[PDB]
Amino acid sequence: ETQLLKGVLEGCVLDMIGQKERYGYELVQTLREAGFDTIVGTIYPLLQKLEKNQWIRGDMRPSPDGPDRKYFSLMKEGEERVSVFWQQWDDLSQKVEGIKN
Amino acid sequence: ETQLLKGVLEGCVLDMIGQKERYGYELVQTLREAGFDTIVGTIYPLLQKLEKNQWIRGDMRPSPDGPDRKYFSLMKEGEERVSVFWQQWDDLSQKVEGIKN
Numbered sequence: 001e002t003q004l005l006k007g008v009l010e011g012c013v014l015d016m017i018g019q020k021e022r023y024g025y026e027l028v029q030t031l032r033e034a035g036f037d038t039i040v041g042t043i044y045p046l047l048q049k050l051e052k053n054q055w056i057r058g059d060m061r062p063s064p065d066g067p068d069r070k071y072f073s074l075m076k077e078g079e080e081r082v083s084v085f086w087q088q089w090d091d092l093s094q095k096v097e098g099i100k101n
Numbered sequence: 102e103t104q105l106l107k108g109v110l111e112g113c114v115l116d117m118i119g120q121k122e123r124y125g126y127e128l129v130q131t132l133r134e135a136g137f138d139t140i141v142g143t144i145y146p147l148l149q150k151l152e153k154n155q156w157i158r159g160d161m162r163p164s165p166d167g168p169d170r171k172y173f174s175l176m177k178e179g180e181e182r183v184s185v186f187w188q189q190w191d192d193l194s195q196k197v198e199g200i201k202n
Contacts, residue, residue: 004108004186008193011105012200035196085105089197092109095136096190099113 009036011085013046014074017056018082023069047072055081110137112186114147115175118157119183124170148173156182 009031016022016030028043050056055078058070074082110132117123117131129144151157156179159171175183 002108002185002189003104003111004189004193007103007105007108008197012197015200034200035192084103086201088103088105091136092105093194096109096113099116099135100187 009043009046010050011082011089013043014050014055014078014082014085017072018074018079021071021073023063023071025069027072050078053077110144110147111151112183112190114144115151115156115179115183115186118173119175119180122172122174124164124172126170128173151179154178 012031012034013027016027022030024044024047027047028039031039031043047056047058051058051072054075056072057075058072060068061071063069113132113135114128117128123131125145125148128148129140132140132144148157148159152159152173155176157173158176159173161169162172164170
């Protein structure tokens with residue numbers, strides 16, 4: 001949808017991958033549990049973009065049940081992009097607050 | 102710059118035009134005073150997009166000194182887009198808070 005929405009899920013997906021190495025299915029479920037109730041296969045295109053951008057990397061390893069899944073973890077560029085995100089989020093939040101009132 | 106940043110200034114520019122009918126120069130100055138210190142002619146491309154999108158309209162009328170300036174005011178679509186913005190901003194703020202902690 002909107003530029004704002006895309007910016008937020010980028011930062012959020014990047015942050016989640018930073019906290020814990022996650023595969024595609026478990027990222028969508030973590031996203032839903034955070035409040036993204038209404039996300040329809042719209043997440044893996046973003047994961048595809050980030051991997052190709054060399055922000056994250058996908059490596060095959062065993063999930064907790066025992067099938068191999070592609071786990072995403074942050075690259076050097078990705079952990080910079082998420083620190084950028086949190087600084088930009090903190091900055092824009094206080095700006096928006098000021099305008100609102 | 103980023104998708105997040107673009108989304109924020111869109112909403113903010115739209116909101117400012119809603120509060121008070123403004124021309125290009127005075128919008129940039131209102132934006133700087135809100136915290137956008139480091140915005141370089143990057144604002145008028147956005148105003149151009151919104152006018153063409155029929156979200157805002159530009160009409161020529163006298164500024165407080167007496168020269169005619171193009172004042173931007175919200176169209177029917179624009180005032181919907183800003184209510185959408187504030188709902189989306191409120192929604193994403195509480196989601197991001199939840200993920201952060």
